[PDB]
Amino acid sequence: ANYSVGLLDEGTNLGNVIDNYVYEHTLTGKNAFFVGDLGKIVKKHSQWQTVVAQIKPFYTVKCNSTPAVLEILAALGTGFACSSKNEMALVQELGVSPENIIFTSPCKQVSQIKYAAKVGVNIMTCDNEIELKKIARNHPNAKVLLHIATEDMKFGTTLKNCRHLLECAKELDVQIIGVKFHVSSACKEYQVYVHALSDARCVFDMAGEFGFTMNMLDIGGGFTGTEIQLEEVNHVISPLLDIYFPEGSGIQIISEPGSYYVSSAFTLAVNIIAKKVVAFVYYMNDGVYGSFASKLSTIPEVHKKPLFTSSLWGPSCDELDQIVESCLLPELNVGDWLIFDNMGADSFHEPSAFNDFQRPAIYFMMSFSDWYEMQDAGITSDAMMKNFFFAPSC
């Protein structure tokens, strides 16, 4: 696998790259494609490091496990949070060491635990006694973070139940080393982080009474990507860390950003393959069984230069595959392209029976200017960047 990365100067932008690939795809098969700005990921990481230099991020692989993304974040210095064996195996295959991997699945299966012990991944979260006994039985070197719930699916245990889990762990001989919590992005009620940190210090207090050595705090993945959202969270947690979890306590603070890094770095272009007048219904060449899976649980722009209520459906035509129930479009025709921005998270899925084994092409770009900065930080020289080939864009 080689990633060819087109370098852009100061005269060319993402609208130009899209126009170029829409021209080439026209002209050829006419597949959906993504464009990935890899310098936007590198900028997300130096944003992290400016605002919260002491919190080490562990990338949530499930957000986007495309190997060019994982290799860039590895070369920038992230850890990785994995929620299956095959996520852990993909990260180890790229050369990440097991000490930079945490196993965060809320329902761990015995063979995932025993896989983790077999490959040396020791750090894992736990919120319940039955998972605790699975870990004890199958992983003798496990280092466990107790996962506390947060009032913002939802995971994590109550504070009352953590006293009991600590007693069980002592009896089962599990090393508890820390606490984890998570707050939703969408929770603009930043005070929830106060009660979370207070609950965590309470667990680090009780666990020290039991004889555990607590040295890791994970504050979760509630980061959208924007500088302002990250600076809001920092404004709330920073004084409480300064105080409950100071410099020199030897307590390492980590987070699990995912969408933070990739969501706004990728843009998707799809074409219209069918058209039905009811108001118009348009069928596109990508759908819920490909890049728009997240619809099951971001505004279309017309690519070409009187508006009707329109729906967009994917290419399966099946009842689940309605991607935009109604928006206002011009009347478009088969073969016309629609462009969706902020398509980097929960979208890079594998070819499968359900998409007839087809997935969009992926094209990568960076500004010369973001590249110069990687060069000057020493990262383009790292063996973790060996598969990337950077050249002035056509």
Tab-separated table of C-alpha atoms in Angstrom:
chain	number	residue	atom	x	y	z
A	1	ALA	CA	0.000	0.000	0.000
A	2	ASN	CA	1.398	3.432	-1.029
A	3	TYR	CA	-0.535	6.666	-0.432
A	4	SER	CA	0.164	9.321	-2.971
A	5	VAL	CA	-0.491	12.706	-1.494
A	6	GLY	CA	-0.985	15.696	-3.864
A	7	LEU	CA	0.729	18.865	-2.475
A	8	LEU	CA	-1.215	22.111	-2.968
A	9	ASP	CA	0.136	25.689	-3.068
A	10	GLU	CA	-1.410	28.593	-2.206
A	11	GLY	CA	-3.153	29.112	-5.521
A	12	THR	CA	-5.134	25.798	-5.416
A	13	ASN	CA	-7.832	24.664	-2.931
A	14	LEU	CA	-10.149	21.690	-2.157
A	15	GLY	CA	-12.843	22.969	-4.637
A	16	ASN	CA	-10.184	22.636	-7.365
A	17	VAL	CA	-9.276	19.046	-6.320
A	18	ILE	CA	-12.922	18.004	-6.319
A	19	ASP	CA	-13.463	19.626	-9.822
A	20	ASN	CA	-10.420	17.736	-11.116
A	21	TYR	CA	-11.637	14.327	-9.795
A	22	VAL	CA	-15.262	14.918	-10.864
A	23	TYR	CA	-13.768	15.592	-14.365
A	24	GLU	CA	-11.644	12.374	-14.325
A	25	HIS	CA	-14.490	10.215	-12.923
A	26	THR	CA	-16.951	11.635	-15.536
A	27	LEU	CA	-14.951	10.564	-18.295
A	28	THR	CA	-14.245	7.083	-16.776
A	29	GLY	CA	-16.438	4.816	-14.639
A	30	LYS	CA	-17.889	7.777	-12.546
A	31	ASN	CA	-17.542	6.233	-9.117
A	32	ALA	CA	-18.186	8.112	-5.785
A	33	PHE	CA	-14.914	9.365	-4.313
A	34	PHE	CA	-13.543	10.916	-1.114
A	35	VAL	CA	-10.929	13.609	-0.879
A	36	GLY	CA	-8.926	13.655	2.351
A	37	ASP	CA	-7.044	16.639	3.528
A	38	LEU	CA	-4.285	15.052	5.580
A	39	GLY	CA	-2.921	18.385	6.769
A	40	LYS	CA	-6.268	19.081	8.484
A	41	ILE	CA	-5.533	15.983	10.626
A	42	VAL	CA	-2.021	17.155	11.404
A	43	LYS	CA	-3.510	20.619	12.331
A	44	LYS	CA	-5.995	18.882	14.680
A	45	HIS	CA	-3.166	17.295	16.499
A	46	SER	CA	-1.139	20.462	16.889
A	47	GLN	CA	-4.354	22.201	18.058
A	48	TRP	CA	-4.636	19.401	20.742
A	49	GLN	CA	-1.086	19.825	21.758
A	50	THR	CA	-1.430	23.751	22.077
A	51	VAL	CA	-4.635	23.649	24.145
A	52	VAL	CA	-4.031	20.456	26.294
A	53	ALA	CA	-0.379	19.500	26.034
A	54	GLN	CA	-0.508	17.266	29.080
A	55	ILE	CA	-3.436	15.017	27.849
A	56	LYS	CA	-2.200	12.186	25.604
A	57	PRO	CA	-4.882	11.297	22.925
A	58	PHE	CA	-5.683	7.680	22.026
A	59	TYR	CA	-7.389	7.793	18.663
A	60	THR	CA	-10.767	5.938	18.477
A	61	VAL	CA	-9.932	3.622	15.550
A	62	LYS	CA	-13.622	2.785	14.944
A	63	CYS	CA	-14.250	6.399	13.773
A	64	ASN	CA	-12.064	5.897	10.648
A	65	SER	CA	-9.645	2.919	10.440
A	66	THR	CA	-8.249	3.715	6.960
A	67	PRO	CA	-4.465	2.915	7.331
A	68	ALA	CA	-3.179	6.261	6.005
A	69	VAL	CA	-5.071	7.938	8.881
A	70	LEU	CA	-3.855	5.517	11.509
A	71	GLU	CA	-0.178	5.862	10.265
A	72	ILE	CA	-0.241	9.622	10.309
A	73	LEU	CA	-1.662	9.660	13.882
A	74	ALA	CA	0.857	7.034	14.978
A	75	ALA	CA	3.766	9.151	13.456
A	76	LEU	CA	2.274	12.296	15.269
A	77	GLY	CA	2.511	10.355	18.514
A	78	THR	CA	-1.151	9.275	19.407
A	79	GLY	CA	-2.081	6.140	21.209
A	80	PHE	CA	-5.100	4.079	19.888
A	81	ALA	CA	-8.366	3.060	21.585
A	82	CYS	CA	-9.639	-0.253	20.009
A	83	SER	CA	-12.960	-1.926	20.603
A	84	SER	CA	-12.404	-5.226	18.909
A	85	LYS	CA	-9.698	-7.769	18.256
A	86	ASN	CA	-9.476	-6.820	14.643
A	87	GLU	CA	-8.948	-3.081	15.587
A	88	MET	CA	-6.186	-4.091	17.974
A	89	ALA	CA	-4.660	-6.426	15.314
A	90	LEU	CA	-4.739	-3.631	12.614
A	91	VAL	CA	-2.982	-1.108	14.925
A	92	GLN	CA	-0.201	-3.786	15.927
A	93	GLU	CA	0.259	-4.669	12.222
A	94	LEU	CA	1.215	-1.029	11.469
A	95	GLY	CA	3.799	-1.202	14.175
A	96	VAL	CA	2.128	0.425	17.153
A	97	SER	CA	3.352	-1.031	20.394
A	98	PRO	CA	0.822	-2.637	22.735
A	99	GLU	CA	1.549	-0.151	25.479
A	100	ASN	CA	-0.044	2.551	23.257
A	101	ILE	CA	-3.250	0.655	22.812
A	102	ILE	CA	-6.276	0.588	25.104
A	103	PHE	CA	-9.088	-2.017	24.763
A	104	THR	CA	-12.295	-0.148	25.416
A	105	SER	CA	-15.148	-2.436	24.326
A	106	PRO	CA	-18.152	-2.231	26.777
A	107	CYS	CA	-18.967	-5.934	26.380
A	108	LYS	CA	-15.636	-7.863	26.175
A	109	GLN	CA	-15.751	-11.417	24.939
A	110	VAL	CA	-13.518	-14.013	26.459
A	111	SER	CA	-11.627	-14.637	23.150
A	112	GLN	CA	-10.994	-10.844	22.732
A	113	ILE	CA	-9.524	-10.842	26.314
A	114	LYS	CA	-7.413	-13.816	25.706
A	115	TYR	CA	-6.291	-12.287	22.314
A	116	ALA	CA	-5.274	-9.155	24.272
A	117	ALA	CA	-3.225	-11.156	26.788
A	118	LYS	CA	-1.653	-13.190	23.874
A	119	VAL	CA	-0.433	-9.947	22.017
A	120	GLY	CA	0.478	-8.064	25.216
A	121	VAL	CA	-2.282	-5.357	25.247
A	122	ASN	CA	-2.747	-4.864	28.967
A	123	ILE	CA	-4.724	-1.629	29.377
A	124	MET	CA	-8.464	-1.967	29.345
A	125	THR	CA	-11.647	-0.384	30.705
A	126	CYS	CA	-14.301	-2.184	32.817
A	127	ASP	CA	-17.679	-1.130	34.274
A	128	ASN	CA	-19.109	-4.305	35.737
A	129	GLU	CA	-18.377	-7.328	37.832
A	130	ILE	CA	-19.014	-10.032	35.222
A	131	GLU	CA	-16.537	-8.349	32.787
A	132	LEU	CA	-14.171	-8.037	35.705
A	133	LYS	CA	-14.199	-11.820	36.310
A	134	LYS	CA	-13.685	-12.486	32.523
A	135	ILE	CA	-10.568	-10.283	32.703
A	136	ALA	CA	-9.279	-11.919	35.867
A	137	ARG	CA	-9.681	-15.450	34.542
A	138	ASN	CA	-8.193	-14.764	31.105
A	139	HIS	CA	-5.722	-11.931	31.439
A	140	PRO	CA	-3.282	-12.093	34.259
A	141	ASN	CA	-1.383	-8.900	33.389
A	142	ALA	CA	-4.470	-6.663	32.795
A	143	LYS	CA	-4.309	-3.033	33.959
A	144	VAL	CA	-7.819	-1.912	34.369
A	145	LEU	CA	-9.440	1.548	34.208
A	146	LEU	CA	-12.801	1.653	36.014
A	147	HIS	CA	-15.339	3.206	33.745
A	148	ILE	CA	-17.714	5.655	35.723
A	149	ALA	CA	-20.954	6.899	34.203
A	150	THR	CA	-21.567	10.530	33.542
A	151	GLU	CA	-25.058	12.343	33.521
A	152	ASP	CA	-25.086	14.333	30.193
A	153	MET	CA	-26.241	4.387	24.535
A	154	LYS	CA	-24.548	5.002	27.957
A	155	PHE	CA	-21.830	3.113	29.754
A	156	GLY	CA	-20.030	3.229	32.934
A	157	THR	CA	-20.843	2.383	36.472
A	158	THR	CA	-22.086	4.249	39.508
A	159	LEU	CA	-19.784	5.465	42.227
A	160	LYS	CA	-21.387	3.040	44.733
A	161	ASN	CA	-20.757	0.126	42.455
A	162	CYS	CA	-16.988	1.221	42.101
A	163	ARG	CA	-16.400	0.535	45.786
A	164	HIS	CA	-17.735	-2.980	45.212
A	165	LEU	CA	-15.742	-3.477	41.920
A	166	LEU	CA	-12.534	-2.458	43.810
A	167	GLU	CA	-13.238	-5.089	46.495
A	168	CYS	CA	-13.855	-7.774	43.807
A	169	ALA	CA	-10.671	-6.767	42.013
A	170	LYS	CA	-8.597	-7.072	45.153
A	171	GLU	CA	-10.064	-10.630	45.728
A	172	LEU	CA	-9.565	-11.589	41.983
A	173	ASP	CA	-6.111	-10.079	41.951
A	174	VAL	CA	-6.810	-7.535	39.083
A	175	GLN	CA	-4.676	-4.401	38.932
A	176	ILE	CA	-6.959	-1.372	38.843
A	177	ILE	CA	-4.726	1.530	37.657
A	178	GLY	CA	-7.259	4.334	36.905
A	179	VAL	CA	-10.609	5.652	35.955
A	180	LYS	CA	-12.343	6.439	32.705
A	181	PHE	CA	-15.277	8.604	31.922
A	182	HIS	CA	-16.754	10.094	28.827
A	183	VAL	CA	-18.945	13.171	28.067
A	184	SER	CA	-20.863	13.580	24.794
A	185	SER	CA	-19.628	16.362	22.308
A	186	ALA	CA	-23.344	17.366	21.975
A	187	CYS	CA	-23.380	18.067	25.671
A	188	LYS	CA	-22.843	21.873	25.669
A	189	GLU	CA	-23.561	21.751	29.479
A	190	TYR	CA	-19.859	21.667	30.416
A	191	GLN	CA	-20.462	21.474	34.208
A	192	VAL	CA	-21.031	17.637	33.808
A	193	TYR	CA	-17.162	17.511	33.676
A	194	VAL	CA	-17.060	18.809	37.306
A	195	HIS	CA	-19.086	16.025	38.746
A	196	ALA	CA	-17.097	13.499	36.544
A	197	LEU	CA	-13.747	14.695	37.887
A	198	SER	CA	-15.000	14.792	41.426
A	199	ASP	CA	-16.378	11.220	41.056
A	200	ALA	CA	-12.990	10.187	39.611
A	201	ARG	CA	-10.998	11.622	42.539
A	202	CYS	CA	-13.350	9.832	44.896
A	203	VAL	CA	-12.450	6.520	43.123
A	204	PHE	CA	-8.750	7.337	43.134
A	205	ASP	CA	-9.252	7.987	46.982
A	206	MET	CA	-11.069	4.644	47.700
A	207	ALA	CA	-8.629	2.644	45.549
A	208	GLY	CA	-5.611	4.002	47.375
A	209	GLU	CA	-7.298	2.760	50.640
A	210	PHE	CA	-7.511	-0.749	49.037
A	211	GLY	CA	-3.781	-0.687	48.160
A	212	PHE	CA	-4.045	0.036	44.369
A	213	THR	CA	-1.535	2.262	42.597
A	214	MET	CA	-3.710	4.623	40.449
A	215	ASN	CA	-1.910	6.355	37.653
A	216	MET	CA	-4.140	6.994	34.667
A	217	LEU	CA	-7.156	9.155	34.126
A	218	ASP	CA	-9.111	8.981	30.817
A	219	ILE	CA	-11.491	11.866	30.217
A	220	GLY	CA	-13.176	10.277	27.169
A	221	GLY	CA	-13.838	11.371	23.595
A	222	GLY	CA	-16.314	14.344	23.824
A	223	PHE	CA	-14.338	16.564	21.338
A	224	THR	CA	-15.883	17.803	18.046
A	225	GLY	CA	-12.749	19.113	16.366
A	226	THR	CA	-13.289	22.874	16.685
A	227	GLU	CA	-10.836	25.008	18.610
A	228	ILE	CA	-13.706	26.681	20.478
A	229	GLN	CA	-15.289	23.392	21.601
A	230	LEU	CA	-11.936	22.053	22.780
A	231	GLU	CA	-11.158	25.410	24.577
A	232	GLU	CA	-14.652	25.189	26.349
A	233	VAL	CA	-13.918	21.795	27.743
A	234	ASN	CA	-10.413	22.870	28.755
A	235	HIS	CA	-11.801	25.975	30.585
A	236	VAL	CA	-13.910	23.646	32.813
A	237	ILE	CA	-11.489	20.721	33.389
A	238	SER	CA	-8.171	22.591	33.536
A	239	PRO	CA	-8.446	24.036	37.115
A	240	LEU	CA	-9.884	20.770	38.412
A	241	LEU	CA	-6.974	18.750	36.898
A	242	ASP	CA	-4.440	21.351	38.188
A	243	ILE	CA	-5.822	20.529	41.640
A	244	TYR	CA	-7.140	16.881	41.866
A	245	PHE	CA	-4.554	15.461	39.293
A	246	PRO	CA	-1.502	17.863	39.354
A	247	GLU	CA	1.744	17.822	37.471
A	248	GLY	CA	4.038	15.541	39.573
A	249	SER	CA	1.341	13.239	40.921
A	250	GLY	CA	2.569	10.748	38.311
A	251	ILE	CA	-1.005	10.426	37.088
A	252	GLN	CA	-1.095	10.325	33.296
A	253	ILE	CA	-4.151	12.029	31.746
A	254	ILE	CA	-5.372	10.569	28.394
A	255	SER	CA	-8.332	11.128	26.125
A	256	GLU	CA	-10.047	9.159	23.300
A	257	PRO	CA	-10.728	11.730	20.470
A	258	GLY	CA	-12.005	10.229	17.254
A	259	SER	CA	-14.283	12.397	15.093
A	260	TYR	CA	-12.112	15.335	16.476
A	261	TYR	CA	-9.356	14.267	14.101
A	262	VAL	CA	-11.114	13.165	10.866
A	263	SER	CA	-14.652	14.269	10.559
A	264	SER	CA	-14.003	17.633	8.677
A	265	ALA	CA	-10.836	16.262	6.890
A	266	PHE	CA	-12.788	14.217	4.256
A	267	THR	CA	-15.341	15.328	1.618
A	268	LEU	CA	-17.416	12.880	-0.375
A	269	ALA	CA	-18.638	13.288	-4.049
A	270	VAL	CA	-21.390	11.024	-5.295
A	271	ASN	CA	-23.410	10.911	-8.515
A	272	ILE	CA	-27.131	10.561	-9.211
A	273	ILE	CA	-27.949	7.268	-10.849
A	274	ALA	CA	-31.816	7.427	-10.958
A	275	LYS	CA	-34.548	10.054	-10.643
A	276	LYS	CA	-38.255	9.700	-9.819
A	277	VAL	CA	-40.862	12.535	-10.005
A	278	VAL	CA	-43.546	12.077	-7.229
A	279	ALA	CA	-41.233	16.862	-5.753
A	280	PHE	CA	-38.166	14.704	-6.790
A	281	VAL	CA	-36.582	11.522	-5.445
A	282	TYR	CA	-32.911	11.038	-6.401
A	283	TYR	CA	-30.935	7.764	-6.097
A	284	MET	CA	-27.206	8.086	-5.618
A	285	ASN	CA	-24.374	5.730	-6.035
A	286	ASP	CA	-23.572	5.600	-2.287
A	287	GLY	CA	-25.847	5.024	0.642
A	288	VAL	CA	-26.475	3.583	4.049
A	289	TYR	CA	-24.677	0.292	3.127
A	290	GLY	CA	-21.524	2.389	2.279
A	291	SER	CA	-20.477	5.832	3.410
A	292	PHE	CA	-23.838	7.005	5.008
A	293	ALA	CA	-24.187	4.248	7.623
A	294	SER	CA	-24.352	6.802	10.378
A	295	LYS	CA	-27.745	7.872	9.144
A	296	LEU	CA	-29.116	4.628	10.692
A	297	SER	CA	-28.335	6.040	14.150
A	298	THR	CA	-23.784	16.445	5.979
A	299	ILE	CA	-25.681	18.960	3.751
A	300	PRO	CA	-25.641	18.044	0.002
A	301	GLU	CA	-24.218	20.770	-2.269
A	302	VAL	CA	-24.882	20.606	-6.020
A	303	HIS	CA	-21.579	20.465	-7.832
A	304	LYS	CA	-22.574	22.144	-11.204
A	305	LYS	CA	-23.107	25.952	-11.630
A	306	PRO	CA	-36.026	27.279	-9.039
A	307	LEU	CA	-35.859	24.910	-5.996
A	308	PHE	CA	-37.996	21.813	-5.315
A	309	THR	CA	-38.400	19.552	-2.278
A	310	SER	CA	-36.139	16.593	-2.981
A	311	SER	CA	-35.273	13.333	-1.259
A	312	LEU	CA	-31.956	11.398	-1.646
A	313	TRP	CA	-31.869	7.619	-1.427
A	314	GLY	CA	-28.970	5.215	-1.851
A	315	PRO	CA	-28.528	2.595	-4.614
A	316	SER	CA	-30.133	-0.342	-2.737
A	317	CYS	CA	-33.746	1.329	-2.921
A	318	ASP	CA	-34.492	-0.682	0.189
A	319	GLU	CA	-36.505	0.853	3.058
A	320	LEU	CA	-33.418	1.767	5.158
A	321	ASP	CA	-31.586	3.610	2.368
A	322	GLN	CA	-33.161	7.126	2.487
A	323	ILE	CA	-30.303	9.409	3.214
A	324	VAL	CA	-32.032	12.859	3.120
A	325	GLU	CA	-35.754	12.803	3.655
A	326	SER	CA	-36.221	16.328	2.165
A	327	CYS	CA	-34.102	19.259	1.223
A	328	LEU	CA	-34.504	21.916	-1.470
A	329	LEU	CA	-32.561	21.281	-4.667
A	330	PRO	CA	-32.757	22.435	-8.252
A	331	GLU	CA	-34.047	19.890	-10.678
A	332	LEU	CA	-31.077	17.670	-11.311
A	333	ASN	CA	-30.421	14.939	-13.774
A	334	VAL	CA	-28.950	11.502	-13.799
A	335	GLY	CA	-25.192	11.824	-13.903
A	336	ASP	CA	-25.120	14.984	-11.846
A	337	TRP	CA	-22.725	15.090	-8.737
A	338	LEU	CA	-23.565	16.080	-5.184
A	339	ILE	CA	-20.848	16.997	-2.671
A	340	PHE	CA	-21.147	16.230	1.132
A	341	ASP	CA	-18.557	17.972	3.456
A	342	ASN	CA	-17.493	16.578	6.898
A	343	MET	CA	-17.817	12.969	5.832
A	344	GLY	CA	-14.610	11.645	7.672
A	345	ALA	CA	-16.227	9.916	10.676
A	346	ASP	CA	-18.242	6.566	10.638
A	347	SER	CA	-18.134	6.496	6.808
A	348	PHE	CA	-15.036	4.453	5.670
A	349	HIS	CA	-16.577	1.004	5.608
A	350	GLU	CA	-15.541	-2.127	3.744
A	351	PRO	CA	-16.937	-3.430	0.367
A	352	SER	CA	-19.609	-5.977	1.257
A	353	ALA	CA	-22.569	-7.943	-0.301
A	354	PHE	CA	-24.818	-5.050	0.627
A	355	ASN	CA	-22.918	-2.451	-1.549
A	356	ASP	CA	-22.165	-5.000	-4.296
A	357	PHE	CA	-18.454	-4.921	-3.131
A	358	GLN	CA	-17.950	-1.289	-4.330
A	359	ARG	CA	-16.441	1.583	-2.300
A	360	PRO	CA	-15.483	5.186	-3.307
A	361	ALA	CA	-11.937	5.926	-4.358
A	362	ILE	CA	-9.909	7.861	-1.785
A	363	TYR	CA	-7.634	10.711	-2.988
A	364	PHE	CA	-5.249	12.473	-0.508
A	365	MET	CA	-4.014	16.132	-0.514
A	366	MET	CA	-2.075	18.496	1.761
A	367	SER	CA	-1.004	22.193	1.462
A	368	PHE	CA	2.832	22.609	0.838
A	369	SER	CA	2.613	24.638	3.926
A	370	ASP	CA	1.266	21.812	6.275
A	371	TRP	CA	3.882	19.420	4.673
A	372	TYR	CA	6.781	21.915	5.479
A	373	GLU	CA	5.670	21.934	9.000
A	374	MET	CA	5.668	18.054	9.229
A	375	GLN	CA	9.132	18.086	7.655
A	376	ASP	CA	10.413	20.539	10.104
A	377	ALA	CA	8.984	18.570	13.104
A	378	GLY	CA	10.998	15.511	11.882
A	379	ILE	CA	7.914	13.388	11.158
A	380	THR	CA	8.191	12.839	7.403
A	381	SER	CA	11.535	11.114	8.182
A	382	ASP	CA	9.913	8.540	10.582
A	383	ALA	CA	9.700	4.917	9.469
A	384	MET	CA	5.937	5.117	10.398
A	385	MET	CA	5.589	7.521	7.360
A	386	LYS	CA	7.308	5.157	4.903
A	387	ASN	CA	4.218	4.485	2.815
A	388	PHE	CA	3.373	8.143	1.990
A	389	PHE	CA	4.628	9.695	-1.299
A	390	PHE	CA	4.203	13.427	-1.458
A	391	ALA	CA	4.391	15.246	-4.797
A	392	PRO	CA	3.271	18.656	-6.193
A	393	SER	CA	-0.238	18.235	-7.293
A	394	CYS	CA	-1.021	18.121	-11.016
